[PDB]
Design a protein around this motif. Structure first.
Motif, PDB file in Angstrom:
ATOM      1  N   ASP A  76      -7.977  -3.913  33.891  1.00  0.00           N
ATOM      2  CA  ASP A  76      -7.421  -3.008  34.913  1.00  0.00           C
ATOM      3  C   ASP A  76      -8.418  -1.975  35.432  1.00  0.00           C
ATOM      4  O   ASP A  76      -8.604  -1.807  36.647  1.00  0.00           O
ATOM      5  N   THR A  77      -9.085  -1.234  34.551  1.00  0.00           N
ATOM      6  CA  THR A  77     -10.114  -0.279  34.935  1.00  0.00           C
ATOM      7  C   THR A  77     -11.179  -0.924  35.811  1.00  0.00           C
ATOM      8  O   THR A  77     -11.568  -0.410  36.859  1.00  0.00           O
ATOM      9  N   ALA A  78     -11.655  -2.102  35.378  1.00  0.00           N
ATOM     10  CA  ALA A  78     -12.698  -2.758  36.165  1.00  0.00           C
ATOM     11  C   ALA A  78     -12.230  -3.081  37.580  1.00  0.00           C
ATOM     12  O   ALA A  78     -12.915  -2.780  38.556  1.00  0.00           O
ATOM     13  N   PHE A  79     -11.050  -3.704  37.674  1.00  0.00           N
ATOM     14  CA  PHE A  79     -10.610  -4.066  39.018  1.00  0.00           C
ATOM     15  C   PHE A  79     -10.144  -2.852  39.823  1.00  0.00           C
ATOM     16  O   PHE A  79     -10.087  -2.946  41.059  1.00  0.00           O
ATOM     17  N   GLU A  80      -9.829  -1.725  39.189  1.00  0.00           N
ATOM     18  CA  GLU A  80      -9.659  -0.509  40.003  1.00  0.00           C
ATOM     19  C   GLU A  80     -10.941  -0.202  40.748  1.00  0.00           C
ATOM     20  O   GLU A  80     -10.902   0.180  41.920  1.00  0.00           O
ATOM     21  N   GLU A  81     -12.095  -0.324  40.112  1.00  0.00           N
ATOM     22  CA  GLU A  81     -13.348  -0.023  40.776  1.00  0.00           C
ATOM     23  C   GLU A  81     -13.703  -1.130  41.776  1.00  0.00           C
ATOM     24  O   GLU A  81     -14.299  -0.844  42.824  1.00  0.00           O
ATOM     25  N   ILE A  82     -13.356  -2.370  41.426  1.00  0.00           N
ATOM     26  CA  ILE A  82     -13.608  -3.481  42.372  1.00  0.00           C
ATOM     27  C   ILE A  82     -12.784  -3.247  43.626  1.00  0.00           C
ATOM     28  O   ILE A  82     -13.259  -3.419  44.759  1.00  0.00           O
ATOM     29  N   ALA A  83     -11.516  -2.842  43.445  1.00  0.00           N
ATOM     30  CA  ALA A  83     -10.682  -2.658  44.627  1.00  0.00           C
ATOM     31  C   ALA A  83     -11.186  -1.491  45.467  1.00  0.00           C
ATOM     32  O   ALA A  83     -11.193  -1.563  46.705  1.00  0.00           O
ATOM     33  N   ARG A  84     -11.599  -0.400  44.798  1.00  0.00           N
ATOM     34  CA  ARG A  84     -12.014   0.761  45.606  1.00  0.00           C
ATOM     35  C   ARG A  84     -13.320   0.452  46.321  1.00  0.00           C
ATOM     36  O   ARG A  84     -13.474   0.848  47.479  1.00  0.00           O
ATOM     37  N   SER A  85     -14.231  -0.272  45.666  1.00  0.00           N
ATOM     38  CA  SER A  85     -15.496  -0.591  46.315  1.00  0.00           C
ATOM     39  C   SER A  85     -15.297  -1.582  47.461  1.00  0.00           C
ATOM     40  O   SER A  85     -15.921  -1.450  48.529  1.00  0.00           O
ATOM     41  N   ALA A  86     -14.426  -2.558  47.235  1.00  0.00           N
ATOM     42  CA  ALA A  86     -14.083  -3.519  48.287  1.00  0.00           C
ATOM     43  C   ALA A  86     -13.501  -2.858  49.520  1.00  0.00           C
ATOM     44  O   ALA A  86     -13.869  -3.170  50.663  1.00  0.00           O
TER      45      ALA A  86
END
Ligand SMILES: Nc1nc2c(ncn2[C@@H]2O[C@H](COP(=O)(O)OP(=O)(O)NP(=O)(O)O)[C@@H](O)[C@H]2O)c(=O)[nH]1
Ligand SMILES: [Mg+2]
Length: 180
Positions: free
Chosen positions: A164-174
Motif C-alpha cells: 500500500d505505501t509503495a503504490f501510494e507513492e506510485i499513484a502520486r508520482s503517476a
C-alpha cells in the motif's frame, strides 16, 4: 461514463520477482501462492484517491519477465505515467538487472523528459528468512540514488507488507507526471 484519462503504470522486472503477486495484492488485496508465469502484457484497474482529495483510475500493466514469454514486444510501454522496477531481495541477479529494465523502458516508452520521468523501485519478498535475503538495503539505496534519487520501497506481496505505501507513492508520482 467509461472513457477516462487513467494513470498508466508499467511493472517491470525479472521473472520470479513477484510482479503479478504485487499487482494482485494492490488491486485485489489477495495473494495466491501460485500464479502462472506471465505471457505478454495485461492490466488491471483500480480506482484510488491520491493524497486525500484527488480521485483517479490506475491502469496497472503486468509484464512477462521471461524472454520466451515476451510475445508482445514492448510497444505497449508508450503512454505510461510511471514505471515500477521490481527486484527480489533474495535474488542478486534480479537486482543487478534493475538499470537494464529502467533503460529498456526509456528507449521504448517515448517519454519526453527521461530525467524527470517517475520510476519507483520495489525490493520484494522482504518477508523471506534473513539467511536467504542477500541484497542489502544500503546497496538498493545506492542504486536508487544513482538512478536519479528514485523512491525505494521494501515489500512483501505475500504478507501484505508495504505494498500500500509503495503504490501510494506510485499513484502520486503517476498523477504528477500525467498532469504536468
Ligand atoms: N516469499 C515471498 N515470495 C513471493 C512474494 N511474492 C511473490 N512470491 C513468489 O515469487 C514467485 C514468483 O511470483 P510471481 O508474482 O508469479 O512473479 P512474476 O514476477 O510475476 N514472474 P513472471 O515475470 O514470470 O510473470 C512465486 O513463487 C511467488 O509465490 C513475496 O512477497 N514473498
Ligand atoms: Mg507474472
Amino acid at each position: 461514463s467509461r472513457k477516462k484519462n487513467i494513470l498508466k503504470v508499467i511493472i517491470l522486472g525479472d521473472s520470479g520477482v513477484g510482479k503479478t503477486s504485487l499487482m494482485h495484492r494492490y488491486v485485489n488485496d489477495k495473494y495466491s501462492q501460485q500464479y502462472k508465469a506471465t505471457i505478454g502484457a495485461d492490466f488491471l484497474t483500480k480506482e484510488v484517491t491520491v493524497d486525500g482529495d484527488k480521485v483517479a483510475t490506475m491502469q496497472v500493466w503486468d509484464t512477462a519477465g521471461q524472454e520466451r514469454f515476451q510475445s508482445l514486444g514492448v510497444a505497449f510501454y508508450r503512454g505510461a505515467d510511471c514505471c515500477v522496477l521490481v527486484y527480489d531481495v533474495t535474488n542478486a541477479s534480479s537486482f543487478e538487472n534493475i538499470k537494464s529494465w529502467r533503460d529498456e523502458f526509456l528507449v521504448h516508452a517515448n517519454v519526453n523528459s527521461p530525467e524527470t520521468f517517475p520510476f519507483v523501485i520495489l525490493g520484494n519478498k522482504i518477508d523471506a528468512e534473513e539467511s536467504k535475503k542477500i541484497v542489502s538495503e544500503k546497496s538498493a539505496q545506492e542504486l536508487a540514488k544513482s538512478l536519479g534519487d528514485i523512491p525505494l520501497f521494501l515489500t512483501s506481496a505475500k504478507n501484505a507488507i508495504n505494498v500500500d505505501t509503495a503504490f501510494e507513492e506510485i499513484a502520486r508520482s503517476a498523477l504528477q507526471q500525467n498532469q504536468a
